[PDB]
Amino acid sequence: MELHKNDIELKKYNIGVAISLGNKWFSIDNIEKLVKWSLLHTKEYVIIFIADSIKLSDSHAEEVAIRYGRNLFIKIKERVSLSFSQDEQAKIIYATWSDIADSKYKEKVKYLYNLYDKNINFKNYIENFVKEWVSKEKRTFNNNEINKFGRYILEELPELMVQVKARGVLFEAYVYPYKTRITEFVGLLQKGEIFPEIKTNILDNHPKIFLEVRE
C-alpha cells in the first residue's frame, strides 16, 4: 500500500480518505489499510468522508449519509478501535455530509446546479458522464434518472476540488485507490481546461491534491 512527492514524506498536509460507498474495492479491510497509510503520512489528522455512492431528504448525499453512511462509519470505528492505539484513534475525524456541506459549500453546489440548468453543454457533458458508468453495469436507466444522477455528482464535486473544512479541520489532500473519470474531470476543471467558468466562480488557487494509493 503506497503512493503511485517529497511533501508527503515531509507530512505537509492533512489527508482525507475518500470512500466510494458500495464500490467493491472499499471493503472494511481496504478502508483500514487506506486509514493506516494516511495516519503514517498525515500532517496531523485523517478525515474519512463519503465521496460518492454509485424520500427522506432533499439532498441525495444527505440521504446516503443517514441510510448507509452512519452504519459504515460505525463499522470503521469498531475495526479501528481494535487495530490502532488510542493516540492514533484520536487523529481520525469521521466527516459526515453535514460536517462538510456548510453554508460556503452549498453555495458552490448551487452554482453548479444553476449551471446544470442554464448551460446545455454542461448538462450534456455531465449526463454523458453518467452513461459511461451505467453502460458498464448490466442494469439500465431512463433519462430522468440519468439527469438526476448527474445532479448527485455535482453535489459531491466541490469536496474533491476545493479545500473544505470538516469540523473545522482543513484537508489539503485525499487518497483514492485508482484514477477515475471523476478525478480526471476534476483535474481538468482545476486547471480551467474544461468549463473555465467553474474555476472562475468557485475555485480558488488552493486545489485539493489527489493521492493515488493502493496495494
Side-chain angles (χ1 to χ4, degrees):
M1 190 79 41
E2 186 68 31
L3 165 74
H4 294 53
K5 180 256 294 182
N6 44 336
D7 300 357
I8 304 93
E9 289 299 85
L10 276 279
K11 296 188 204 309
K12 195 177 163 66
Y13 316 113
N14 293 320
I15 300 181
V17 177
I19 287 178
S20 304
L21 182 67
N23 181 305
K24 275 192 165 92
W25 191 91
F26 285 88
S27 62
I28 291 287
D29 301 293
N30 280 337
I31 291 169
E32 193 261 355
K33 295 176 179 305
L34 275 193
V35 170
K36 192 174 280 196
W37 187 89
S38 298
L39 278 162
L40 291 146
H41 286 89
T42 177
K43 167 189 157 202
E44 189 178 7
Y45 301 94
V46 181
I47 297 83
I48 308 190
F49 64 105
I50 282 120
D52 54 273
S53 64
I54 303 290
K55 185 50 77 187
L56 301 181
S57 173
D58 299 5
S59 151
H60 172 76
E62 171 67 5
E63 176 138 12
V64 167
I66 66 182
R67 289 184 176 278
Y68 308 112
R70 182 179 167 275
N71 300 312
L72 171 60
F73 284 1
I74 284 296
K75 287 169 57 164
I76 298 186
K77 288 184 190 183
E78 285 198 66
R79 171 68 187 264
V80 154
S81 77
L82 301 174
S83 301
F84 303 86
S85 70
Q86 172 196 312
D87 307 334
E88 263 154 328
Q89 298 173 45
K91 303 171 176 190
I92 302 178
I93 309 181
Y94 298 86
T96 71
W97 176 248
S98 324
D99 298 331
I100 301 170
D102 64 14
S103 191
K104 188 164 184 170
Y105 193 97
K106 292 181 194 283
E107 289 180 340
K108 299 181 169 64
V109 175
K110 182 170 75 167
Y111 170 84
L112 294 173
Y113 284 174
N114 188 271
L115 190 67
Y116 194 60
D117 298 326
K118 301 291 176 52
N119 184 317
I120 308 81
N121 298 275
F122 187 65
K123 185 199 303 179
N124 282 14
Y125 197 80
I126 295 295
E127 291 175 342
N128 280 12
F129 214 106
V130 176
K131 298 169 182 185
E132 289 185 323
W133 289 332
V134 318
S135 75
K136 162 179 58 190
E137 303 289 41
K138 278 147 301 310
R139 175 162 179 174
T140 62
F141 307 88
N142 67 268
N143 258 41
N144 197 31
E145 284 172 339
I146 293 295
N147 184 263
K148 279 168 71 180
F149 286 152
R151 261 170 122 71
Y152 304 166
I153 291 167
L154 304 178
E155 205 165 30
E156 301 175 311
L157 225 37
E159 73 187 344
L160 303 178
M161 292 200 290
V162 316
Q163 284 173 14
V164 299
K165 292 192 175 179
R167 286 193 183 93
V169 171
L170 187 79
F171 58 104
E172 305 97 329
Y174 70 95
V175 293
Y176 196 76
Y178 289 107
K179 295 177 196 199
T180 62
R181 304 174 188 271
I182 289 296
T183 62
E184 301 266 307
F185 182 51
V186 163
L188 297 178
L189 289 165
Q190 291 174 322
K191 307 210 173 54
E193 293 285 27
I194 201 170
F195 301 108
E197 60 269 44
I198 293 177
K199 179 187 177 75
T200 301
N201 270 285
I202 64 171
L203 311 187
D204 48 62
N205 271 351
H206 295 293
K208 185 161 275 71
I209 288 182
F210 162 51
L211 301 169
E212 188 178 0
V213 174
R214 64 171 179 270
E215 47 276 1

